[PDB]
């Protein structure tokens, strides 16, 4: 409602740009619950190298509980193309949206906008 994030998403400075809308930590499967069946997942790619498959294992956990599924991606790495390609293939099968940010503020913006 006024968002629900996972306490496993703390630390992440993107929460610092979630200023225009109210948000709070809740125990939910996805990273952010934005509506009764809309939910997002954050994957900082740079971290994507450091132990990946987690984003893959993260979508199977979510399964199908939310209608609008979205993947917030922070492009914090040069020459990202390669990964985006294999991540996108994953999203069509998972039928979730692929969104691209490049800063912790930009993604933070993407959150105020989906609840707005």
């Amino acid at each position: 409602n006024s968002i629900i994030v996972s306490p496993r998403q703390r630390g992440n400075p993107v929460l610092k740009f979630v200023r225009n809308v109210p948000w709070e930590f809740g125990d939910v499967i996805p990273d952010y619950v934005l509506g009764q069946s809309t939910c997002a997942l954050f994957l900082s790619l740079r971290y994507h190298n450091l132990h990946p498959d987690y984003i893959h294992g993260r979508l199977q956990s979510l399964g199908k509980n939310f209608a609008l599924r979205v993947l917030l991606v922070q492009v914090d790495v040069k020459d990202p193309q390669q990964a985006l390609k294999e991540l996108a293939k994953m999203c069509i099968l998972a039928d979730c949206t692929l969104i691209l940010a490049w800063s912790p503020e930009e993604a933070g913006r993407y959150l105020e906008t989906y609840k707005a």
């Binding site: 630390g11 992440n12 993107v14 994957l43 971290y47």
Partner: peptide
């Protein structure tokens, strides 16, 4: 610090 926990995000 550098304690990358879990959550698709570098820490």
């Amino acid at each position: 610090k550098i304690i990358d926990t879990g959550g698709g995000f570098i820490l």
